[PDB]
Structure formats: C-alpha cells, structure tokens
Amino acid sequence: MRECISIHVGQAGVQIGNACWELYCLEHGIQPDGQMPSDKTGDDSFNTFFSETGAGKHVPRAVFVDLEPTVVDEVRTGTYRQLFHPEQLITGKEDAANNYARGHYTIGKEIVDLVLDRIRKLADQCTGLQGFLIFHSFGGGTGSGFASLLMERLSVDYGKKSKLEFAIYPAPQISTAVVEPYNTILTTHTTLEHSDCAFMVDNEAIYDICRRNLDIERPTYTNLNRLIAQIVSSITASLRFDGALNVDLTEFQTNLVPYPRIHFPLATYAPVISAEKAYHEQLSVAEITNACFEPANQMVKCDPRHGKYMACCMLYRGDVVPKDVNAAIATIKTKRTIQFVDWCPTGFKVGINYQPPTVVPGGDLAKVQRAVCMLSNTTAIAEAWARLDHKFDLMYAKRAFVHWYVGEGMEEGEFSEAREDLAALEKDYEEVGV
C-alpha cells in the first residue's frame, strides 16, 4: 500500500542506484535473477520497492534514465541484467557535456515524454505511492537539466506526493568539472519551487569519513555509493519494516521544512565503523547519537558549529530501547556545542525500527546492532551557497563559458535570474538564522 518510485538521473544517479538496488536485493533476500531462494520458512517488506509481476519474480520500481548510453548500458550488461525492467533503463544517444542548456532545452525534450510515461505506468501499477526518490548530482547536464525538467513535469502532473531528492552537491575546494558553478546555480532556481525535501551529500565528506572511520585511504566511488545506499535504506526502513513509532515519507516534509523556500537537510549515518574499531567498541545508543553531531561525521563539507540547528529527524535502526534515545537527546540539549534556533523548543522527530542493518559481502561496513540516520535541517548550508555564489560571480565577471549556453538556447538573463534567486535564498537563510 506504501510504495516509492526511485528515479535515477545521470551517471552518478545510476551508479548510486546500482549500489542501492544491490543493498535492497540483499536486505529483502532477492537473488540477482529476481527470484527468492524460497526455503518455505511470510515476508512482505519488499512491497515498496519490488513489484510482484506474478511468476516468482520481483522487479524494481526504478527508472534509470540518462542521455549518455554508457553507465546504463553497463547496468544493462552487468550482473543486474535479468532483474531490472528492460523498458525502465531509458537512454538517449547524445551526451549532455555538463551543459544545463543541453540537458534542459535541446537534448532531453524528446525523451522526457518517454520517462514520464514509464513513471506514469509505474504509478498506475502502484496503489498508494508515498513519493519519488530522485538520485542525481548538481554537476551538470543530465543531473542538472534533465532532473530539473523532471521536477517541473512531475510536479505539474502529480503534485501532492513526496519528491525526495538525493543530490551530490559540489565540494568546497575540489571537484571534477569546471562549469559545475554554472550548472549548480541554474539547477536550484528551477528546482527550488518544485520540491519537498532535497538533501545533499558531499564527496569530500564521504572521502573524510571513509579515510577516517573506515581506514580506506584510497576509496573509489563504490564505497561512496554503498555509504549513500545505507542512508537511503535507513530513511525508508520505516516504510519497509515494522517497529516502534514509524516515520514515513510524509513527516519528512512537515517536520524538516519550516518555510517553503528552505527544504535542505543533511544526512548523517553514523555508526560508520570498521571491523577492528567495532570489535574494540561497544556501540550503544548514547555513543551513536553523539557521533552524529560531530563535524567529522557529516555527509556534507560544511561547518555545523557555526550554524543553528533548525530541526532534526532521528531514524534509529536495530536493537534500540526507546528511553536511551530520549536520554541521548536530553544530553544533546544540555550540550552547548549544538546550538538550536530560538523558535524551536521541540526540535527532534524520533523514529525507531527493529530491523538490524545489513552488510554487503565485500565492502567496508561491519555488522552492527544499532544504526542512526539523522536528517538534520540546519543553517550551516549558507556557507556552501555563499562559496558557490562567489565561484559563479568569478566565472561570470567576464562571461566565461557563457557562449555554450547562449548558442545552445539559454537566454543571457537566465543566469541573472538564477543569481537573484540564490541571493533571495541567502537572505531567507539570514532571516531564518537571526
């Protein structure tokens, strides 16, 4: 009755979806061919991610979409070939070349109807859809233009239902591309007004977490995507399994978004640990709650102590006794390092689930009794917005890399409008903070 549709936009979204669906098949006991191992000895928790087209086979409620047919072709020829729906792996022909204009105006206008028809068929098969989980990046092209185009063309059709966004936000001092400031400025102006909860995960933050808490000095994107897959599994395990008081995709909007223009929390899955450290540790509720407010165990590279906490959503998973959560939150409230905003005496949404987390054979995380995922709305993101504002101003001072957008179809004033929208967002964050 309670199902979610996972749209994966861009190469990063497709690889995140690879890790996420591997984890989903693992924790629901689904082989890569789509079959249960039977074994006789009533599980039904898959009926939020796996449509049971009745033959003994379960198919995902996922739409992989991309313009470049490389990473989706890797999925289509890889190990999860006989599991995904063949007409749910939508690919274009041309790439997008980190161009918001080529992802929103030129290449993607002939394929948006196809991806929306697949989404419409999935929703018509669905029977009480909570919402969509859209995995993408603000790097550019498909993840910037096409994902935003999906935001308007899904909000104008459906509305109402949740649209949770998993953005790979650009890092402060490092990145891969160069026009990511332009793409990130252009994405938010068209994505902000049509969204419900759009939270961000940063590459430097995962690199620090993997190098420190996991002792992976040379981590690839596989560890990053697995570590985000654990976050999404912990954010939907309340919908999937039973437990204590449960937080579905409806309270995520009304408990984390105080004002309509500010919907930007931060993830924090923080019993992140390796085998030796977990062997010598006795991981308990107070420790795993105190490990979530540390600036080292943050999923974005920002400064949380130079900011005021708006709201928090605790998602506990495993052998969690409820009063230990309340004692941990009481200790956090008496702590001075964590600062809350004044118009918020009550500021936590606590939800406990009984299902222990699952470990992937071959990986980095260890099997642990307890898990905590914070969804924390704070005012610390204004520093990141200000530094990308500075990057955009430096690149737009003498019209660097503008001719591509202008010749592709983007109007010159669109950059100014997105600049004004980000300036309004900075003023909104300042007014909230004061």
Partner: protein, 431 residues
C-alpha cells in the same frame, strides 16, 4: 447494560488499545480464539460492558480501530489477540496525515470520518443502554489529534448525553520526539476542553520515570508502558465491570470529581507497583497502597502535585479489604496535607472498593487526580506555541491546506483561559 464504545486513533492509540484489550481479555478470561476458559462466573456476569457476542458464544470487542495508513493497524492484527477484533472495525485509509493536524482534520481524515461515524452508529444501535465512549490518542501526534478530535466533536453532536472519557498522551517536557507537538496539542486541546466529559492524560517521560524508578525494569520498551497504562485503564472501570462493597461508574466519577465544566483533566495512577527484588520484602496493605498512590513518583503526567492544589481525588480500590481502612487512610492523608488540598471542598476524596482484584495481585488501587498542577503543562505547551507562532514556523502546511491564523489564535486564547481558570481556582480561598 452499561456499554462503553472503545476507540483507538493514531499509532500510539492503536498500540495502547491493543495492549488494553489484551490485559482486559486476560482479566475476563477470553482466549485468543474468543472463547471463555475462566474459573469464576463473575468474569462472565458483566461481559457485555466491552464485548459483543457473535455466533457460537464467542466475544468480539466493541472497539473501532482507526488510522489513516495501514501500519500499526496491521501490526495489531498480526499480533496476539488480533483476530478477536471485528474485521469490519478495521477501517483504514491509504494516505497519511503524519503530524499534520490540518490534514487529519480537513483532508482525507475528514471523509473517512463518515465511515467511522457509521461504524459507531452501528455499535451504539446494537445496544440497549450506552454508558459512553472512550478514545485513545496522543496530543502532539498525527491522526490522533486530528481524526480523534473530529470523532469527539461529531460523536458529542450525535449523542449529547453519554459519558465521554478520552485518555490521550500529552507531550513530554524532556526530549522532543515530534517538532509540531505544540501546534497539534493546542489544536487538539481546543476541541477537548468543551467536548469531552473527562480526560486522563498520559505523559511518556513520567511513564519512563515510573518504570525506571519504582519497578527498575532495565529496558521495558513501549509495550510495558502500554501495559502499565492499561492497568489504570482497567482500574478506573472495574467498579462498572465487577461488583463490590462500593461501586462508582464513569458518570458517578465525573460528577464527583469535576467541580466546574472546564475543569476535567485528570492524572491517573496505578499503585500496587513493586520491583522484582522488593516484592518479597514489601507488605501489601491498604495504608501502603495509599502511600504509593499519593506518592508523586506515581504520577502518569508531567506534573508536580507539590506545585499546585488537588481539587479532587478518586480512589478505586480492588480486592477484599475493610472499608474504614480506606476511609481512615484518606482522612489521614487529608489531615496530614492541609496545604495541598482545596479548602472550600470538605473531604474531596471519592472512594470506591470493588471485590475483584486484578490478575496476580491480592489488593490494588487506582488514583485519579484532578488538580491545578496541569497548569504547568498547559503553560509549557502554550509558551512553546507562542514561540513557534511568533516566527510562523511550520505554519505554512496548515495555511496552505486551508486553516488560517485566526483558528490558531482562538485555540491559544482558549487554552490561556483554561490556564487562567486553573490559577484562579488554585488561588481562590475558602473565606
């Protein structure tokens, strides 16, 4: 006939109602197959108060289980004592309110309430003399403060002559556990002031303190809190259920406690409470039971009786005991504590002793206390409401769904009038 239509609304309401039905079926001898395997016929003598005889002499509770999503509803059905419930009374939605009082009161909560009114209309029509309605929900939550208060209003309109006793869970001073608790609690208590005849509020950290201190329990989770509230649930109805030396029904308790029609928020308390190790060291007598009842560590609400005045005390004793034991134990409490009782009500303790104790206890006692100590909880919720409403935080959901700021201001003003009435009757002298 004295029948109470029972209702569970919200996740907390559904779980605590399931635990209450488990413990009351244990008291009445009903097995998970709906048959009777008790030893004394006194269990059967007044089955009709909450059960409903189907074909073959089986019993089904007169409980409406409602929630806007199939969740805890399915958990209750799959758990023990789940098949006893009527599958027609498992009314559910498909959407979800989710801490969204506007959505639970004006969206799809407001269209399924017609079906819930139809179900309670059938349950009341298939009776002869309805005593009243009780409902379990949670202020500061989702559908319990939503459809729950809507149900209270519509059923009070339909049957404006029956005893209405909401139990409800109020928000906790320590921890947060939900950010829109002040909004939902104010909007629900604004309905609960004028509609409900009596309310027996539950507070989660008070239950945590009573489990950790007076029973140790290490980790009793949520099910044992549900059990320890269900003890008081059965405790203040056992005079209606079982016979005894002095009987007090719900209407008698309501008239003997409530001084003025606004003043109807009580505190429950169960006090044959012992730890595991001290149960072989403690002696169970009526003075010891009264000591544990009037102990402030047994208050189920976030309320300090020392910072206030007890308007009225109700004491439901269960077991074979003398009568002036109870009478002199309340005389002694009143004479020892003259500064904590109202001076203008002489002997404000209403006692009732029934002959049938609960399971596994020789004697037991339930304390129901109407005080002015609820003023601190309501001024907490009111100041939290003003703190959020000054900066209009989390209000855009309610306003973009359809209520306005005028309803919020009226709810805040009404609850402030309730606080002022509590303070006025606390500070009012006898002469």
């Amino acid at each position: 006939m004295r029948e109470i239509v029972h209702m569970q609304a919200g996740q907390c309401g559904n779980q605590i109602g399931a635990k209450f039905w488990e413990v009351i079926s244990d008291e009445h001898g009903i097995d998970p197959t709906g048959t009777y395997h008790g030893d004394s016929d006194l269990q059967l003598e007044r089955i009709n108060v909450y059960y409903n005889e189907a074909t073959g002499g089986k019993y089904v509770p007169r409980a409406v289980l409602v929630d806007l999503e199939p969740g805890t509803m399915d958990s209750v059905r799959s758990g023990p004592f789940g098949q006893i419930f009527r599958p027609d009374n498992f009314v559910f939605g498909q959407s979800g309110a989710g801490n969204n009082w506007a959505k639970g009161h004006y969206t799809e909560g407001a269209e399924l309430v017609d079906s819930v009114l139809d179900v309670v209309r059938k349950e009341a029509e298939s009776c002869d003399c309805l005593q009243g309605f009780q409902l379990t929900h949670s202020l500061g939550g989702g559908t319990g403060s939503g459809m729950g208060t809507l149900l209270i209003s519509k059923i009070r309109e339909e049957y404006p002559d029956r005893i209405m006793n909401t139990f409800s869970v109020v928000p906790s001073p320590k921890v947060s556990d939900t950010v829109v608790e002040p909004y939902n609690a104010t909007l629900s208590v604004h309905q609960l002031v004028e509609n409900t005849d009596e309310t027996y509020c539950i507070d989660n950290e008070a239950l945590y303190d009573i489990c950790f201190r007076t029973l140790k329990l290490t980790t009793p989770t949520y099910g044992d809190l549900n059990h320890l509230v269900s003890a008081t649930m059965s405790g203040v109805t056992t005079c209606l259920r079982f016979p005894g030396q002095l009987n007090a029904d719900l209407r008698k308790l309501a008239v003997n406690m409530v001084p003025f029609p606004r003043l109807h928020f009580f505190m429950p308390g169960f006090a044959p409470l012992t730890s595991r190790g001290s149960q072989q060291y403690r002696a169970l007598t009526v003075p010891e039971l009264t000591q544990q009842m009037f102990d402030a560590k047994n208050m189920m609400a976030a309320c300090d009786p020392r910072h206030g005045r007890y308007l009225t005390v109700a004491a439901i004793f269960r077991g074979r005991m003398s009568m002036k034991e109870v009478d002199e134990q309340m005389l002694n409490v009143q004479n020892k504590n003259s500064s904590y009782f109202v001076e203008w009500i002489p002997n404000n303790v209403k006692t009732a002793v029934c002959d049938i104790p609960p399971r596994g206890l020789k004697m037991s006692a339930t304390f129901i206390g109407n005080s002015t100590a609820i003023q601190e909880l309501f001024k907490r919720i009111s100041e939290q409401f003003t703190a959020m409403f000054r900066r209009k935080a989390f209000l855009h959901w309610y306003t973009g769904e359809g209520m306005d700021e005028m309803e919020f201001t009226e709810a805040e003003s009404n609850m402030n009038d309730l606080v002022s009435e509590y303070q006025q009757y606390q500070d009012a002298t006898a002469e």
